[PDB]
Ligand binder design. Structure first.
Ligand SMILES: CNCc1ccc(-c2ncnc3[nH]cnc23)cc1
Lengths: 20, 336
């Protein structure tokens, strides 16, 4: 499931703003 | 609305052109707990001793701001937040700087981040998501009318108050701009395609970001996700999104018009402006005046327990607030 794929991803914690 | 906004602009412009400066000092506050931390700096719960009022105090290390090339952006944040006033925004109550740091003092929202509740609960019902969305639509209408673009909508930046209403905070990338702008900024999942494609862009990126937020609130995950930002960007520009089967017809239709790569068709960006959104069928049950007036019953209210209670926030390592004996970056932040 999409939910299962999200939860297994490295991006369920707080997301940082992009740098450059 | 037009009338309200006219007067709001007059109020804003006086403060925009003559910013408040040096309106408190660190020694007037008792630090209590770190509520968040990262490249944005730190935000702490503090108590103002003379009144016993609690506030959220954002602390930026001037040297760190300089290394990150965020001088002008930080000057934007402070100048904007001291000039605005809106129910679903955290305006500055005070600001000041010392040898080492910049400080911005704002209303404390004790209910925690939307991010925390969304992740724990998993997803929000459509009525729950709509209640929050309505507040963001009104806030953007306000901000945009003042020529401000927000540029970092996400659950991590939306604080829930004691009444269960929200406050948009962290204006580190907010900017007053009448034309187009070009800075590559934001959070990967929420970036409009035109930002990724390095085009000049405008306030329409906030309305795309709203599409992502509503999707995430209702689905429990964002419309474009992957393990690394590059693969997220591939999905965003591709021109395709899938909706969960539980999304209502009206929700899907709203999101197809917000998450619209074509700027001539993206809701918020058309001739009729924000009313394409306010008058969409998904918002049919929304009493916009009652939302603004905070007369609507929140579908979720946080656990009370206390005035400076912090149980709705995560625990972060507590670092010193060090103040050098030497003034750092004085010229860079002279106007702060
Ligand atoms: C990424 N999130 C970091 C974070 C967490 C909590 C707050 C905050 N919490 C409570 N009240 C506030 N008023 C202004 N900001 C805040 C601000 C920033």
């Amino acid at each position: 499931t999409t939910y299962a794929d999200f939860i297994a991803s490295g991006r369920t914690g707080r997301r940082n703003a992009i740098h450059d | 609305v037009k009338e309200f906004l006219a007067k709001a602009k007059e109020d804003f412009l006086k403060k925009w052109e003559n910013p408040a400066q040096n309106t408190a000092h660190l020694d007037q506050f008792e630090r209590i707990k770190t509520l968040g931390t990262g490249s944005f700096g730190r935000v702490m719960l503090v108590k103002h001793m003379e009144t016993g009022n609690h506030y959220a105090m954002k602390i930026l290390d001037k040297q760190k701001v300089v290394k990150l090339k965020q001088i002008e952006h930080t000057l934007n944040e402070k100048r904007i937040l001291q000039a605005v006033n809106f129910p679903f925004l955290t305006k500055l109550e005070f600001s000041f700087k010392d040898n080492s740091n910049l400080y911005m003092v704002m209303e404390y929202a004790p209910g925690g981040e939307m991010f925390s509740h969304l992740r724990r609960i998993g997803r929000f019902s459509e009525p729950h998501a709509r209640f929050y969305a309505a507040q963001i639509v009104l806030t953007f209408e306000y901000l945009h009318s003042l020529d401000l673009i927000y540029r970092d909508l996400k659950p991590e930046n939306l604080m829930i108050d004691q009444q269960g209403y929200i406050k948009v905070t962290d204006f580190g990338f907010a900017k007053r701009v009448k034309g187009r702008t070009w800075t590559l900024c934001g959070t990967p999942e929420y970036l409009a395609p035109e930002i990724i494609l390095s085009k000049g862009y405008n306030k329409a990126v906030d309305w795309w970001a709203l599409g992502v937020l509503i999707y995430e609130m209702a689905a429990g995950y964002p419309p474009f996700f992957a393990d690394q930002p590059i693969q997220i960007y591939e999905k965003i520009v591709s021109g395709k999104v899938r909706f969960p089967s539980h999304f209502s017809s009206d929700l899907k239709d709203l999101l197809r018009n917000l998450l619209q790569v074509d700027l001539t068709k993206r809701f918020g960006n058309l001739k009729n402006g924000v009313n394409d959104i306010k008058n969409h069928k998904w918002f049919a049950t929304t009493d916009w005046i009652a939302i603004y007036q905070r007369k609507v019953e929140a579908p979720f209210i946080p656990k009370f327990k206390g005035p400076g209670d912090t149980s709705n926030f995560d625990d972060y390592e507590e670092e010193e607030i060090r103040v050098s004996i030497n003034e750092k970056c004085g010229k860079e932040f002279s106007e702060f």
